[PDB]
Design a binder for this molecule. Structure first.
Ligand SMILES: [Zn+2]
Ligand SMILES: [Zn+2]
Ligand SMILES: [Zn+2]
Ligand SMILES: [Zn+2]
Lengths: 73, 73
DNA sequence: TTAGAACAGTTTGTAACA
DNA sequence: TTGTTACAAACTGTTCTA
């Protein structure tokens, strides 16, 4: 079972250095590049699952970085 | 003056029994009548402000009920 | 004055190009 | 095979009708 390391959906491949779904690979590019500072409404430890991944952009981006995601040098 | 009790935006009036903005009005009617069960990805204590109010619909709908909002009556 | 619908913009996600 | 990017749908918020 190929699985997004960030939200648990099916992965679609290895994107930006990590096994992710298509939703999370495009979020990462948008977030890591954007000029939109994401502040968590709680504790910087929200649960990122495939039903609530849109809830906290800050915690989703954090889980992307901790999964090894990167914009490739 | 005139600030939303749920998110702190400029309140547009007394909607559904509480002083809210137009955003939290319409969120309440959609959520309270909707068939989507909202589960907080944290500890049911998310900060609801006008910058992050869309993050946690569960904590937002909670704060609506703690503010006296209702359908009808 | 506000409830309710419709419109509009924002945001997220999918599919397709290279 | 994947990174951009465009296309599409989901979603939140605004304006408007009663
Ligand atoms: Zn994912
Ligand atoms: Zn968070
Ligand atoms: Zn509000
Ligand atoms: Zn919450």
């Amino acid at each position: 079972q190929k699985t997004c390391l960030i939200c648990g959906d099916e992965a679609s491949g290895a994107h930006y250095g990590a096994l992710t779904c298509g939703s999370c690979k495009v979020f990462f590019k948008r977030a890591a590049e954007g000029k939109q500072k994401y502040l968590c409404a709680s504790r910087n430890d929200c649960t990122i699952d495939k039903f609530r991944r849109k809830n906290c952009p800050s915690c989703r981006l954090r889980k992307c970085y901790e999964a090894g995601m990167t914009l490739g040098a």
